[PDB]
Amino acid sequence: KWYPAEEVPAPKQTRKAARPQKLRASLVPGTVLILLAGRFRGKRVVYLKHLEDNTLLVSGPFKVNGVPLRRVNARYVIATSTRVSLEGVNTEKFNVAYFSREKLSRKQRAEAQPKKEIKAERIEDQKNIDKALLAEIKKTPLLKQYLAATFSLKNGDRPHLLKF
Amino acid sequence: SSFEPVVVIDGKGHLLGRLASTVAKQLLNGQKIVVVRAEALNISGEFFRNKLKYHDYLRKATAFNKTRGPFHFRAPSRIFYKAVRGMISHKTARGKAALERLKVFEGVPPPYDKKKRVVVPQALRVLRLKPGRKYTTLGKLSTSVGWKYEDVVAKLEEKRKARSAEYYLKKKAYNAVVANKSATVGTEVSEKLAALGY
Amino acid sequence: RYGATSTNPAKSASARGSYLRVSYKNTRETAQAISGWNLQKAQKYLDQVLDHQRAIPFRRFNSSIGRTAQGKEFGVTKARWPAKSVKFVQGLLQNAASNAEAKGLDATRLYVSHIQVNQAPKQRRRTFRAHGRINKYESSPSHIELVVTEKEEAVEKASEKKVARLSSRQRGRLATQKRI
Amino acid sequence: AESHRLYVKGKHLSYQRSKSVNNPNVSLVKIEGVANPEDAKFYLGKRVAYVYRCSKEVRGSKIRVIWGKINRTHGNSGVVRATFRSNLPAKTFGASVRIFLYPSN
Amino acid sequence: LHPKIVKKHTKKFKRHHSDRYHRVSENWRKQKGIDSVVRRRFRGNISEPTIGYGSNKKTKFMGPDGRKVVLVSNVKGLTPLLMHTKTFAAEIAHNVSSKNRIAILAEAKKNGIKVTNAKARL
RNA sequence: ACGUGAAAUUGUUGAAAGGGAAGGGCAUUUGAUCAGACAUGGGCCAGCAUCAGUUUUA
RNA sequence: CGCUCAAGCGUGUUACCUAUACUCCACCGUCAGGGUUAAUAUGAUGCCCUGACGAGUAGGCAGGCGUGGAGGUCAGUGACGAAGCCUAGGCUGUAAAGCUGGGUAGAACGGCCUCUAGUGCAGAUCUUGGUGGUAGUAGCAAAUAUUCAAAUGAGAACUU
RNA sequence: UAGCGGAAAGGCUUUGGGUGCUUGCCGGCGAAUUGCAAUGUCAUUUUGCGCAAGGAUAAAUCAUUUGUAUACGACUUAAA
DSSP: OOOOOOOOOOOOOOOOOOOOOOOOTTOOTTEEEEEOSSSSTTEEEEEEEEOTTSOEEEOOOHHHHSOOSEEEOGGGEEEEEEEOOOTTOOOOSOOTGGGOOOOOSSOOOOOOOOSOOOOHHHHHHHHHHHHHHHHHHTTSTTHHHHHHSBOOOOTTOOTTTOOO | OOOOSOOOBBOSSOOSHHHHHHHHHHHTTTOOOOBBOGGGOEEESOTHHHHHHHTTTTTOOOSSOGGGSOOOOOSTTTHHHHTTTTTSOOSSTHHHHHHTTOOBOSSOOHHHHTSOOBOOTTSOTTTSSOTTOOEEETTHHHHTTSOSOTTHHHHHHHHTHHHHHHHTTHHHHTHHHHTTSTTSTTOSSSHHHHHHHO | OOOSOOSOSTTEEEEEEEEEOSOHHHHHHHHHHHTTSBHHHHHHHHHHHHTTSSOEEOOSSOTTOOBOGGGGGTTOSBEEOOHHHHHHHHHHHHHHHHHHHHHTOOSTTEEEEEEEEEEOOOOOOBOOBTTTBOOBOOOOOEEEEEEEEEOOSOOOOOOOOOOOOOOHHHHHHHHHHHHO | OOOOOOEEEEEEEEEEEOSSOEEEEEEEEEETTOOSHHHHGGGTTOEEEEEEEOSSOSSSOSEEEEEEEEEEEETTTTEEEEEESSOOOSTTTTOEEEEEOOSOO | OOOOOOOSOOSOOOOTTTTTSSSSOSSOOOOOOSSOHHHHTOSSSOOOOOGGGOOOSTTSSOOSSSOEEEEESSSGGGGGGSSOTTTEEEEEOTTSOHHHHHHHHHHHHHHTOOBSSOSOOO
């Protein structure tokens, strides 16, 4: 009898605007951060630029501790008190399209060899930023050693009391 | 307020129900313990009384075949063990799982002595009970009702002490020094800073 | 025909015996003592039971049976020497052995693989109790069967594999550890 | 060097319950050195993960995890209500659980 | 965007003392007792079927596919479901012969109509 | 002791549990097993951001 | 259990735990109050909107599920396998139940619209038939008594 | 190399040799792509599998027998 019509949902005109992010006051360009989650967990790093997909452009000089130019989510990071000046650094060319990528069909396996396929643009751009920051970092004592070491909780340390 | 592989408590000066009241709670939290010197747990009341609140527990038992009736242990250790396996629903895995975490001795056996033990304030005849009352010293009690070792566990609890005195003294000289010198030596600049760093 | 077996049919022999007038409870205890033994071992054991050296352990059907010292072999107190139960089972083994000889199988490797004894239709017969009451007096006959097999080595081995699966970030963990 | 711990230790105490009846959808969690409600409010809305091992290898590993989070405080002794993606075994009463530091401020 | 199905109560309503006594089957039957606790609803006992457990009107008589099943015994019985592939799935009967399944399954796959069974013996 | 050959009830093999009974309801975990649209040229499980409805805590 | 400036008795001041109760949202059903084929495909019994309520023995009414036969209709299904039976396989319905994979087996049987009844069982010290635990247990003890060889026979405490 | 420790000692100091690292203070190379988080697997038990070194070379039951025992088991004796 009925056998429903194969017409379709065509949905109501929604009312949800895309307003920009309001970041917390602790994060300001130049601030040292502690990475909580991910591959480089508990690794001290440097904040550079706010990107336009609500992520943080983060270096933490590759020559010091081996952490490259990388995206980071703001909720999975701590903001410490220390800062460094970024007046002799560019960070204009970097955008969301800079970190674009072709996800590969798919594929796996035998040795899905992989020590390959890094751009010369990415290697040279790493050298320019690291050279500017190291001149700034060598002003204050014991900062180069601070970024090298990792963060780990001790017996007695209660996170709710600490300042960071 | 921190977790450890084990926690050794030194009864003495400690009451009973109030101590037992804690020793238990813990367990229900995958902890551990190992009371000692039980032969020194204090109990509110005038010696006499108590012994009555006992001679009555001792006159409670099956009628048609004791053997299977309430087993009245005499030795202390087990006592401060009863006042507990009664504060726990000890008829459900969880219960057991809890008692296996425990252990109580009257005296101080090896697998410890060489370890630091602690007290549990909220329960020390001196922070509670008012001054001018009367408290019974377990052991002594037990005796008058069984337990034939209130003279052995005493002849030993000595072969120990006597020594602990030595270990000490030796632990002053070495320290009466490791402190002496930290007096001159670079006790400078590096402090005029660390003294502030704090 | 034949109960739930799980062995090679080509290297096997069998023998049945339906509507036998023996105790169903006693024949079960004889058929479980013999089970899992070598064929030549068994025929000597059943002869020793008749002459009172060895004994049959009564495990399941054993209420109000007396104790005996011969039961210590198996680790059970109660045991008996059922004559009539053994003579029927001893007969079926000699039939099953001759069946294997016809096929051309080795006697030394031959062992009892499967054995079973379920109930039969009961023969009915009456008695006279007090105050003119008639009760039954029935028999409990048996349906015996057994299977013998050429015993051999190398039974599993076996079996499963994997065809593995893991994520990209989980794959990436292996890449670094091979380098270091 | 020695320690690599980026989480706070804790213990799964019990379910939300009355005298007799209980509710296994909400769990109660203890935290190290948290004696008040005011101190425990630091740990609200933080991710929590129970860890346990197995014999069989499911997906190239012998460790399985049940994710969850903290909702609100419970009582006047720093005890915390906690929800999980799937509820916990009940044998886990008095077992270790990891309180992470993300969704941070 | 099709509404996601929620079954409310997936566990089967068994009759009281179905496992206890053999003669009492597992088909549901209301207790008409006076001492009975299942009728009066006591804490820690079996549930009873009630209108509150009923499914949503948007997604009633739909499987995991989101399709209402129709029973088919022949090729001429497939002609109601020609322009209704997304809404109505098919299922071939138990009494149909082996060769006649191949006749229905051939012309079913032409029009793009999903059959629940078949599979098809093989 | 002959078409089909159900249940009570029994034997064998396989799997599981068992400290004064078993057997149920709510919720997980582990062990087993099972449905369901990534096929064309060669959906399931989460994370962050800005909003709406109801609340809580400084 | 244990408790003694209490974990006791009288009184005050705050926090906190918690019912199927109260507030808010999702879905189900029942009842009421409306709006609409003005050609405008598919059920006017339709297709939508808004608001309230939900315990229940004895009892009454309503709407459905199944069993055996009768009239109609799908030119329904079937020896290339109908009915029945077994299945820690699957899907739908709140449920009564229905549909379907695998095995066994070998002649008939289903859906939809109506008619009709010897039409649904757990109880009745229910009726007839079958089988358990109890249990290889109770027991097979009154009339004085049996023993040794030989023969027959597959086999002899019991026959000659 | 020395000694201490019987309460459940199964652990504590201790002479000396040999062999690494040393963030006590300065240097020079390396890490990227696990792609914006997904415990990201670093413990500790048992266990029997084959290796290859070192080491040793038995008893108890049943049947028979006894009466200091004995409902039947058990117990007590003897026997190359």
